[PDB]
Symmetry: C3
Subunit: 306 residues, 3 copies
Amino acid sequence: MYSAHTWPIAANMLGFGNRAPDGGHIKDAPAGVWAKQLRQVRELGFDHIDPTDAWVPLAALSDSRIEEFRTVLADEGLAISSISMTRSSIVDVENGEKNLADAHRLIDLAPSFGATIVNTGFMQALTPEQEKQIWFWLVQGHVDDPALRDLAIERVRELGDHARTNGIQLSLEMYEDTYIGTPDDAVAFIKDVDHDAVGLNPDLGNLVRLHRPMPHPSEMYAKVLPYSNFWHIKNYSRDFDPATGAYSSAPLPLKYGYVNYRQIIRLALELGYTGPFCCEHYGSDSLGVCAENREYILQVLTSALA
Amino acid sequence: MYSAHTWPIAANMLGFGNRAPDGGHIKDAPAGVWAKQLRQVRELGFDHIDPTDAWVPLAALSDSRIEEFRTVLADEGLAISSISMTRSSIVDVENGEKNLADAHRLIDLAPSFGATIVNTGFMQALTPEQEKQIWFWLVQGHVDDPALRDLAIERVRELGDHARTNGIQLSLEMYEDTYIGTPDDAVAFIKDVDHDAVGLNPDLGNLVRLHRPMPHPSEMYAKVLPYSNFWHIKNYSRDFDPATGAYSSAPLPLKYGYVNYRQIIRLALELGYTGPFCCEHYGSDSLGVCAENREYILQVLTSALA
Amino acid sequence: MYSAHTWPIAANMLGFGNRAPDGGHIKDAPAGVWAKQLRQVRELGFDHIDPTDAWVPLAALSDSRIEEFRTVLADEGLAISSISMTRSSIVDVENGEKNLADAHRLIDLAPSFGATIVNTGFMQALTPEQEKQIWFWLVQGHVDDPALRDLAIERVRELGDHARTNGIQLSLEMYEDTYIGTPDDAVAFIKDVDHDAVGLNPDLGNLVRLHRPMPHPSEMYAKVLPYSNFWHIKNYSRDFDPATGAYSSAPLPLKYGYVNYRQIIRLALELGYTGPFCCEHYGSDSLGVCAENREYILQVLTSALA
Ligand SMILES: [Mg+2]
Ligand SMILES: [Mg+2]
Ligand SMILES: [Mg+2]
């Protein structure tokens, strides 16, 4: 596997969004604008990023703009270890075929950067009601259509074939209200896919934040880590008040939230986990917390691998 | 403007209160007692303080005691960048005229320390019911009297004239249940004041903590930052449980709470903000969290100004 | 007293539990297994540990296994400053006499390690319903039997006699729903015990986390610190929503929770507190947060003792 100091721990770029400081789309911005965003990430200690598809859209750039991007990525001291598609489901009713095609494009781009994972999930656009809430997860939004599960499996396998040929893997991001929205459902889904270049991304912070019953993360992670090839890793406080029935959660650094990631990262290692990490953190100071989380993971790994 | 390393980031002294370790009033204490309190602040890395009016009452000291204070302030490696009056409203029914007179005294004292802001707000004493709560903001206390708004504007302008003559500015601290207790109300108030030596202090942590509907801080800060000349800067987690209607909040470091202060400080800069900062943090380890917050702001500024 | 840099600040070992990585009991593990657990603690900066009775059971080991343990403790750069029995009440109906005997054994072992405290409390096993909750403290579990208070006092005194003879002291851990589950009850209990080698352990985080009315920690600590000889020191956010009646709490570093431990540690010192500290933190990254808490305490002490 990697050693602690070379294990990729990527900054997820979704917090930058896709608007340029001048008001247009980031896809059209001069490379120097991209460079200043990347610089903020390097300043906080990262070696790796995950550009997502919610920042500079690599699948959409011309080949010459890809090379402009490649130059500033290197100049700013960074590399891409994974590419995570966000709210771009391959079974979106309107855009699923486009999203599938973009996923294939990202599988071809990934090896050129040295990236080893393309990640997809079944989350879709936030609904208007979700956008009004203090956090989007406070109300249910998109719920996967049961009639499209077989299509989802077919398209996952198609992507996995391409990934395998390119020497990389596809990862499937666990997310609420989707085909892979509970530990048992995720396990059954990855077993049904039956593809040696596809694995889970156990982004269980997505579940721990929810105001609904949830098994303890120790139990959930033990189920899904054996099938995991990539890891969006974030934490939340979690609380409940039996007398009222109120739940609460707050995004927090890995060290401070409800999951014990010292125990869980060590468990992952024990279970043979070898995939890259990706620090995500919706809300709060997303980038600043991700940077603390990277340092945290590096200490945990250093101790566990010594 | 300032550079990142010279931008004043003051420790607010209100957490020391006004009781001396021996049991009397801090106003009567030997200068060495003041020195040991100041030393705790310097030990945590600050260059600047804001004494408030809730610690050593500078407006009340004799001139010779002011010089005693000035000596220990320098000896302990600190300087005053702003002076923030607390629960000392210039339209308090009993003490408003005294508070106005004290504000004028502070405007005369400020330049001697190199301070560039005197800050006033419309908060008043906590009520007995507020004092019984886990946090004072859990119940409504003082609510400004509509019949005194014109008097408030008149007295603000009077202070602003004095500030202008002294080469400094007055700032108006946003605080719930006052004339400047919502973004729109604060904007309308500063426009009505119509004075080029008066500005807002967008202490929006005061609002984010409240168990009531509140616009997202991105939206609120965008409205008020164009009018801001000083900044009490603090954060809170913020959560809500739709099924019960319960709200919750907890004081936290800037990096960890609901506001994204990386984005918001950069926005402020983009909007031409140049005033000093003041780290405030009611509850918890107020001084310790303020010290982390200062280091946080310095990193954000360093990156944004590089 | 101690100086800041020699004041013992122990890592509580209960978060390791008593299962060995291979699946058996830690009591049977090779010393090298113990060494790797101890190493994680030293890596995070500790000089001292409190083994508890929930990790390697020192009272149960043979004398030759004690010496095996002693060797790896030294090899890994650590020492024992206190031994805290957990859910091992000396008035447990089934196991009280065994627990009493084990407490005596620990009083004989403690001086050999240089430890100055053996700590006992009246908490008992978590109930099945407690084990199902998001946190055990969300539902009431064991409640002490009033008819056994006199027996408890008798057995405390018996332990205190032994402690005194051995040049150490017994501490009594405050914990909800026990004889010492409120400040007033703890004070009355320690006064009734009337023993100069017994004192309180004011683990008031145990109370601050609870979803019930609670006096402010300033008030509670002022009552119990005069009687305290040892200190399990942890923090929680604490919040309440009057409109719904919902409470919430989350384990957090000392610096970030509801108690102001800068003020409270300084108060302790003022009140003559001289006992060792023990960093405990149930849930979250227990060890990682304890390590930050140790650094925190060392800064507070350094400033207060300078
Ligand atoms: Mg994710
Ligand atoms: Mg303020
Ligand atoms: Mg304890």
